[PDB]
Amino acid sequence: TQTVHEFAKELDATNISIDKVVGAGEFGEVCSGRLKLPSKKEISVAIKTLKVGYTEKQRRDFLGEASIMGQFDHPNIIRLEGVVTKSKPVMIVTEYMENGSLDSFLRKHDAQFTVIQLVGMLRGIASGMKYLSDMGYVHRDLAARNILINSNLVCKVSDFGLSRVLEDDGKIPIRWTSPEAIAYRKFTSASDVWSYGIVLWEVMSYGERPYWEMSNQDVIKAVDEGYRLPPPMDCPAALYQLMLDCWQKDRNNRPKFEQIVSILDKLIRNPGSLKIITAARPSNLLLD
Amino acid sequence: QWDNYEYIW
Ligand SMILES: Nc1ncnc2c1ncn2[C@@H]1O[C@H](COP(=O)(O)OP(=O)(O)NP(=O)(O)O)[C@@H](O)[C@H]1O
Ligand SMILES: [Mg+2]
């Protein structure tokens, strides 16, 4: 399709080799493999295929997500290497992220990273989101499951399935979504900052599910009433406060992504600050 | 984790 070729290179399939299946998505399988670049350098890639017998809607959605991804060239946003559309199966080829989805990676390593390592992950996510927001997009699905992490623990924003341009022109990830976006579809970069606060909690909780298994209706009611997720075990005060700030009821009082990046950069620059750690509550969620 | 995405009823 022409739409995708504005922002995606058409790859020659002879330059793509497939190694093994590493996942499955809405649209088909995901494999690891290799791509030979025009310079003859070979790089590791992920290869997503559109399932045989796809509908035209599935093809548009599949390629549409690539068209959005291809608009971003940033170290903390998943890199699109290109697409294959002139032969079938249709393919999307992206940089390989050895350690997979961030939530599942952290669950394998409960309490095994240093606070500075976790802050490094969080800073990358924030930097990617700062660029995404600079580019006029709202992601709408920012969550640990939609961050990929590579062999050197660099985290990158992925999954542009719900993303859109902020303009005057389906199911929602309720637990990750701001109260105003739930209430009346008010999606802004500040609603992505809310979601970032949730990702911050997910990371400091080593991939615990936000609000655990609370019903979505209770998540909506509790959050609207002013309840918030409690501090993760051994969570630095600085980082819990950042969560609370991301979760301000008034979206205009939330920090911008640029401010989040700056905050994390200071914590990285002054790691002793992380040593001040965040008790008896009448409820599991904290009021305020 | 089955109800990550949902409508509001
Ligand atoms: N760039 C990548 N590098 C390495 N692994 C990847 C990459 N992209 C996706 N994967 C793997 O593929 C899995 C599924 O792909 P994903 O992008 O999460 O689509 P999905 O529709 O959300 N499937 P799922 O997470 O299982 O419900 C991820 O959990 C990773 O393990
Ligand atoms: Mg996924």
Side-chain angles (χ1 to χ4, degrees):
Chain A
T1 204
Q2 294 178 333
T3 302
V4 77
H5 285 134
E6 182 168 8
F7 302 107
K9 180 186 189 187
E10 182 73 19
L11 300 172
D12 183 337
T14 74
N15 287 323
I16 299 168
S17 65
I18 287 175
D19 169 9
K20 76 205 178 187
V21 176
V22 303
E26 193 198 326
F27 298 107
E29 294 205 297
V30 181
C31 288
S32 63
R34 265 166 105 81
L35 177 64
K36 195 162 183 74
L37 305 167
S39 66
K40 311 306 193 186
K41 179 169 162 210
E42 295 164 15
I43 57 166
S44 283
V45 292
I47 301 142
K48 287 173 63 176
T49 56
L50 185 52
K51 68 194 210 183
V52 176
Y54 58 84
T55 65
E56 279 312 298
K57 170 157 187 67
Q58 286 173 326
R59 180 180 156 93
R60 278 193 311 275
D61 288 347
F62 187 67
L63 291 176
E65 195 267 347
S67 306
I68 294 175
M69 177 176 288
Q71 293 175 43
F72 310 119
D73 182 2
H74 190 276
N76 301 106
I77 299 173
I78 287 291
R79 179 171 177 86
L80 177 67
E81 292 298 333
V83 297
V84 176
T85 63
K86 294 175 192 315
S87 60
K88 301 187 194 182
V90 171
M91 293 182 165
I92 294 168
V93 183
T94 59
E95 67 182 304
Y96 190 57
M97 303 291 285
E98 291 87 344
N99 284 318
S101 301
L102 181 62
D103 66 326
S104 54
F105 179 72
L106 294 172
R107 288 196 281 271
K108 284 176 68 173
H109 306 288
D110 190 60
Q112 297 171 19
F113 296 119
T114 67
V115 56
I116 283 287
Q117 279 176 308
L118 294 174
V119 171
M121 296 173 194
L122 288 161
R123 195 276 185 198
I125 297 164
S127 184
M129 289 302 304
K130 197 273 178 180
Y131 188 59
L132 186 144
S133 56
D134 271 13
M135 289 292 287
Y137 277 84
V138 63
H139 188 281
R140 296 187 73 240
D141 199 13
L142 182 57
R145 67 168 176 283
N146 291 335
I147 303 302
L148 292 166
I149 178 169
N150 73 11
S151 67
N152 294 321
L153 308 181
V154 175
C155 287
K156 304 192 185 205
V157 178
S158 183
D159 201 333
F160 299 92
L162 291 197
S163 181
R164 62 185 182 76
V165 177
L166 281 160
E167 51 181 21
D168 288 343
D169 176 45
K171 300 191 179 180
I172 58 164
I174 292 170
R175 289 163 143 67
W176 285 268
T177 301
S178 73
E180 72 278 359
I182 291 167
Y184 71 113
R185 316 181 197 178
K186 185 54 56 179
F187 291 95
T188 65
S189 287
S191 59
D192 276 350
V193 170
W194 179 283
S195 303
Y196 184 86
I198 303 291
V199 171
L200 179 46
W201 189 93
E202 292 183 281
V203 169
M204 302 311 297
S205 300
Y206 284 86
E208 181 58 272
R209 186 168 193 236
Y211 309 91
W212 313 283
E213 313 304 323
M214 287 180 62
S215 64
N216 281 322
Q217 85 173 13
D218 281 318
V219 171
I220 292 165
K221 192 79 184 70
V223 169
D224 176 71
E225 286 182 13
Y227 285 89
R228 302 292 183 260
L229 291 164
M233 190 163 287
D234 300 321
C235 187
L239 290 169
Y240 192 59
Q241 182 70 50
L242 182 56
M243 293 175 215
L244 297 185
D245 290 348
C246 291
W247 301 332
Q248 286 301 108
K249 183 184 204 68
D250 181 347
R251 67 179 166 286
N252 299 138
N253 292 336
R254 297 175 198 152
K256 307 309 186 198
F257 280 114
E258 184 175 18
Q259 293 171 311
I260 295 171
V261 173
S262 295
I263 287 161
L264 295 170
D265 277 345
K266 284 180 176 180
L267 293 171
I268 289 173
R269 168 174 179 264
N270 183 39
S273 65
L274 296 166
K275 296 171 188 163
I276 304 177
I277 303 306
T278 323
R281 296 192 303 279
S283 55
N284 213 353
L285 299 181
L286 192 168
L287 184 49
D288 193 333
Chain B
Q1 152 274 124
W2 79 97
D3 56 343
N4 281 344
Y5 304 81
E6 210 158 54
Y7 286 111
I8 296 153
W9 311 321

